[PDB]
Amino acid sequence: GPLGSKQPPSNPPPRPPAEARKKPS
Amino acid sequence: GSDITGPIILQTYRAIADYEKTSGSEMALSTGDVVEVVEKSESGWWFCQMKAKRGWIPASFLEPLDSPDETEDPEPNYAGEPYVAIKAYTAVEGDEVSLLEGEAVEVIHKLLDGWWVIRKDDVTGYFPSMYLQKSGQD
């Protein structure tokens, strides 16, 4: 039932993981 | 399992954290798994299809598996553009900001990780991209 486009969640995504920030690489 | 390059033009990404949905939507993410993005936005929420089902996953938590694009590459300019808070939210962390329904602010950087950087009254912080809309220039 195409009514437009894929709507986004009503709640933002959780902040990035510490391992990702502390170690960008 | 792996054919020659050609008809394969998808956005492959690899996760690095265990994210188990959040609300009545999105999708489950297990460290080490790969997602073939089907659709993407700026709200910070990405649409990707897995060997089983698809849904919405956190770009921030995600980590390019080999996608030549490597996600959009914006430019953190202190100039930024004015944005007006379109949602009510109170800072819960030092990094995040605090705004109400109508409290304008000046963006300092816009990323795909959703939570954008917003400087309200000379206070740069973190605030969801969607939680606010654009309202600058002419």
Coordinates of C-alpha atoms in Angstrom, one line a residue:
Chain A
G1 CA 0.0 0.0 0.0
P2 CA 2.3 2.8 -1.3
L3 CA 1.3 6.0 0.6
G4 CA 4.5 7.9 -0.1
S5 CA 8.0 7.1 1.3
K6 CA 9.6 5.2 4.2
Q7 CA 8.8 7.4 7.2
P8 CA 11.5 7.8 9.9
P9 CA 11.2 6.5 13.5
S10 CA 9.5 8.8 16.0
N11 CA 12.7 8.6 18.2
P12 CA 16.2 9.7 17.2
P13 CA 19.0 7.0 17.1
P14 CA 21.1 6.5 20.3
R15 CA 24.4 8.4 20.5
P16 CA 27.5 6.7 19.0
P17 CA 29.5 4.1 21.0
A18 CA 32.5 5.0 23.1
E19 CA 34.7 2.5 21.3
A20 CA 33.9 4.4 18.1
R21 CA 34.9 7.8 19.4
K22 CA 37.8 6.9 21.7
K23 CA 39.2 5.0 18.7
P24 CA 38.3 6.6 15.3
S25 CA 41.1 4.8 13.4
Chain B
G1 CA 28.6 -15.9 -2.9
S2 CA 30.6 -13.1 -4.5
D3 CA 30.4 -12.3 -8.2
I4 CA 32.4 -9.9 -10.2
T5 CA 31.9 -6.1 -9.8
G6 CA 29.2 -4.7 -12.0
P7 CA 25.4 -5.1 -11.3
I8 CA 26.3 -4.7 -7.6
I9 CA 25.7 -1.0 -6.7
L10 CA 24.5 -1.2 -3.1
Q11 CA 25.5 0.6 0.1
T12 CA 27.2 -2.0 2.3
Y13 CA 27.8 -1.0 5.9
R14 CA 29.2 -2.8 9.0
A15 CA 28.0 -2.4 12.6
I16 CA 30.2 -2.1 15.7
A17 CA 27.7 -2.1 18.5
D18 CA 24.7 -4.2 19.8
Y19 CA 21.6 -2.0 19.1
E20 CA 18.3 -3.7 19.7
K21 CA 15.7 -1.5 18.2
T22 CA 14.2 1.1 20.5
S23 CA 10.5 1.6 19.8
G24 CA 7.8 0.0 17.6
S25 CA 9.9 0.1 14.5
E26 CA 13.6 0.1 13.4
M27 CA 15.6 -3.1 13.2
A28 CA 18.0 -5.2 15.4
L29 CA 21.7 -4.7 15.0
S30 CA 24.4 -7.2 16.1
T31 CA 28.1 -6.3 16.1
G32 CA 29.8 -7.8 13.0
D33 CA 26.6 -7.8 10.9
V34 CA 26.4 -6.1 7.5
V35 CA 23.5 -4.0 6.1
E36 CA 22.7 -3.2 2.5
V37 CA 21.1 0.3 2.8
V38 CA 18.0 0.6 0.6
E39 CA 17.1 4.2 1.5
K40 CA 18.7 7.0 3.4
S41 CA 17.8 10.3 5.0
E42 CA 19.2 13.2 7.0
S43 CA 17.2 12.7 10.2
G44 CA 20.0 10.4 11.2
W45 CA 17.9 7.3 10.6
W46 CA 18.9 4.9 7.8
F47 CA 16.9 2.3 6.0
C48 CA 18.7 -0.9 5.2
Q49 CA 17.8 -4.5 4.3
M50 CA 19.3 -7.5 6.0
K51 CA 19.5 -11.1 4.8
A52 CA 16.2 -11.5 6.7
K53 CA 14.2 -8.2 7.1
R54 CA 14.9 -4.5 6.8
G55 CA 14.1 -1.4 8.8
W56 CA 15.7 1.7 10.4
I57 CA 19.2 1.6 12.0
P58 CA 21.5 4.2 13.6
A59 CA 24.0 5.5 11.2
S60 CA 26.2 6.6 14.0
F61 CA 26.4 3.1 15.4
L62 CA 27.0 1.9 11.9
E63 CA 30.4 1.8 10.3
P64 CA 31.0 1.6 6.5
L65 CA 31.9 -1.9 5.5
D66 CA 33.3 -0.9 2.1
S67 CA 30.8 1.6 0.6
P68 CA 32.9 3.7 -1.8
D69 CA 30.7 6.6 -0.7
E70 CA 31.7 6.3 2.9
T71 CA 28.5 8.2 3.9
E72 CA 28.0 11.9 3.1
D73 CA 31.0 14.1 3.8
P74 CA 29.7 17.4 5.2
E75 CA 31.9 20.4 6.4
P76 CA 31.8 21.6 10.0
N77 CA 31.6 25.3 9.5
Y78 CA 31.3 27.6 12.5
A79 CA 29.3 29.8 10.2
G80 CA 26.4 27.4 10.1
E81 CA 22.8 28.3 9.5
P82 CA 20.0 29.3 11.9
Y83 CA 17.6 26.5 12.9
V84 CA 14.4 26.7 14.9
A85 CA 13.6 24.0 17.5
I86 CA 10.6 22.1 16.3
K87 CA 10.4 19.9 19.4
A88 CA 10.5 20.2 23.1
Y89 CA 13.5 18.6 24.8
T90 CA 15.7 19.2 27.9
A91 CA 19.4 18.5 28.0
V92 CA 20.2 15.2 29.8
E93 CA 23.9 15.3 29.2
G94 CA 26.7 17.9 29.2
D95 CA 27.2 17.6 25.4
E96 CA 23.5 17.8 24.5
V97 CA 21.7 21.1 24.4
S98 CA 18.3 22.2 25.9
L99 CA 15.6 23.8 23.8
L100 CA 11.8 24.3 23.8
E101 CA 9.1 24.4 21.1
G102 CA 10.2 27.5 19.3
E103 CA 13.6 28.3 20.8
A104 CA 15.7 29.3 17.8
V105 CA 19.3 28.4 17.6
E106 CA 22.4 28.5 15.4
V107 CA 23.8 25.2 14.0
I108 CA 27.5 24.8 14.0
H109 CA 27.7 21.4 12.3
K110 CA 25.3 19.0 10.6
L111 CA 26.0 15.2 10.6
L112 CA 24.2 12.1 9.6
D113 CA 24.5 10.7 13.1
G114 CA 21.2 12.4 13.8
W115 CA 22.0 14.3 16.9
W116 CA 23.2 17.6 15.3
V117 CA 25.4 20.2 16.9
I118 CA 23.4 23.3 17.9
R119 CA 24.6 26.5 19.5
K120 CA 21.7 28.2 21.3
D121 CA 22.5 31.6 22.9
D122 CA 26.2 30.8 22.3
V123 CA 26.0 27.2 23.6
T124 CA 27.0 24.6 21.1
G125 CA 25.7 21.2 22.0
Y126 CA 23.9 18.0 20.7
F127 CA 20.2 18.0 19.6
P128 CA 18.4 15.6 17.2
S129 CA 18.4 16.7 13.6
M130 CA 14.7 16.3 13.1
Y131 CA 13.9 17.9 16.5
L132 CA 14.7 21.1 14.7
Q133 CA 14.1 22.5 11.2
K134 CA 16.0 24.9 8.9
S135 CA 15.1 28.6 9.0
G136 CA 17.9 30.8 7.6
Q137 CA 19.0 32.7 4.5
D138 CA 16.3 34.1 2.3

